[PDB]
Symmetry: C4
């Protein structure tokens, strides 16, 4: 639905984030009854990408499939793919790491701690001695030790990988492997 629509919406997101299938299905049911399918779909895509994210990238991607199914079907049948994804999202590994990393990056810009794009990263089609831009694909492991962060932000670390699921365990390993390579 006595409750406001935004309180049901809030409890829906918090239930899925909180791994409670039954509560999330209860709040989905209330939303289905109220009938704003477009809002359910929007909120479901936010949840999968905010709270599940790198915990299960395939499942987060599958919410978009389910939403496209929902738009094509409409209620009552739309409720079926949404139920499927809600259960999947509730029980998958949770990660907000990428969401928080970008928000840390946005914080530095709004506070004016941003620098300029380093000259070797600028578009050469529009346009200092040295190697210029190094294309990683030419190198072993398709990686080159190169500065990409602006001079003012060379020490910035936004992304702290999590190990709640096997996908981000491996991404995190790669992240620290690169940090070892750079030293």
């Amino acid at each position: 639905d006595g409750d406001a629509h935004y309180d049901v919406i809030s409890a829906f997101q918090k239930s899925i984030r909180g791994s409670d299938v039954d509560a999330a299905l209860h709040y989905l049911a209330r939303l289905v009854e109220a009938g704003d399918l477009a809002s359910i779909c929007r909120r479901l895509m936010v949840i999968g990408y905010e709270d599940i994210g790198l915990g299960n990238p395939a499942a987060a991607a599958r919410t978009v499939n389910a939403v496209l199914a929902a738009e094509k079907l409409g209620l009552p049948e739309a409720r079926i793919p949404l139920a499927d994804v809600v259960v999947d999202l509730c029980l998958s590994p949770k990660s907000n790491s990428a969401y928080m990393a970008l928000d840390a990056a946005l914080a530095d810009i709004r506070e004016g701690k941003a620098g300029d794009v380093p000259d070797h990263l600028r578009d050469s089609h529009y346009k200092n001695r040295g190697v210029g831009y190094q294309y990683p694909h030419h190198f072993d492991q398709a990686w080159v030790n190169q500065q990409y962060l602006p001079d003012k932000l060379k020490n910035a670390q936004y992304y702290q990988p999590k190990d709640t699921g096997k996908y981000e365990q491996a991404l995190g390993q790669q992240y620290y492997r690169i940090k070892e390579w750079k030293e």
Copy 2:
């Protein structure tokens, strides 16, 4: 035969894991020529009967429907056939479908309550005491989410017909053991 009987038989054959029967009914539906109707039914079947048995296969139905729409008949029949076989021989699960309809039954029968205060939107004792699971170990906190009236409600009973829901089910029960 009425269109709705062929439709019914199509869904029942896929749910029943009969490739040859499902393809016979698909063929009947293809020959009748209403592609959007076929596509709607397939997405429903994929999500209703396959669901958590093979989430990737259910999602792939949407990909095939999009291909079908862009191609049109006769070529549209090809992604649809591919999908029918996949769904027929994939593990079957109706658990999530049944769980939501049990939740809906509780709401229609007035048995549901109000949003617990800590779950309410704080931007509008609203939200007071809410614990954000991402700060915790395993990204999970013991916290009430169901309304007080439905605190003993149990809608979802995990199936184990496929390895994906096997793993989701283990997590479901793991959480139940954590809460004791």
Copy 3:
């Protein structure tokens, strides 16, 4: 050189697992600028020739086509190249495609019968009536789904060129063993 010949050659090269030839014809098509015909044919190839050989790759062709459409040429060529290589080097199956065409043939030749009464839509003979597979073990029930006239029909002959259809095929024959 004619457009349909290049289109024909494109499909045959991918089906034939020749990356270098498929990319040559893709390039001929890219240079002719008909992005929509590349997209249509690539979705046909993915589902017709790769199909159950790699269902994720056939579905990924739709993602690429959506990217191609959103980007336009020249940038559209990149998602297309990616999936052309993927489709060329993926396991090939035409089994689903051939199975549906076998089912269509039986209908067009008047060998089909009517929907069995237990599969008809109830919302519009003594015995069990329709049995619902989700109630059963392995979510499967022995129940006829083919019409009486087509009760001995086999349309789907599973292939084993990739691990996915191998497992689908194993399930298909298991059901056949269960039914005896």
Copy 4:
């Protein structure tokens, strides 16, 4: 600082596996509020630089872009952040992209020939004619698909930075061993 430079630095950082730098330029673009440019560039990066390194990650970019379009800013920044970190830490391959551009080069330099007779469309010399790969073992046939003028051409050179293309690459050389 110009829009084109931030767009450039964004791609270069992701290609360069720098999560923190990619998110910084992502953030700049989000603050500028051109959602469409982020979406366009991300689809190009996914397919250009990741490509066969992680085909499912490249495809997921399209899912994230569709989510982003339906959500709009500020909420659209969330799916986009997710795919950014994924792409940064995914295996990199530009092999398919470089292969098609090599194929395009031969066409523009007039080194291309005509479609071989057996590959031409049959709906509009002695010997076996067109052989259909699906009739054969491993669904492959030793057959010419490249035009006579380009019979020795090699565009695709498989990389092994990811497990997916490791396998595709092995299949590429297995076909080469079969042809000798």
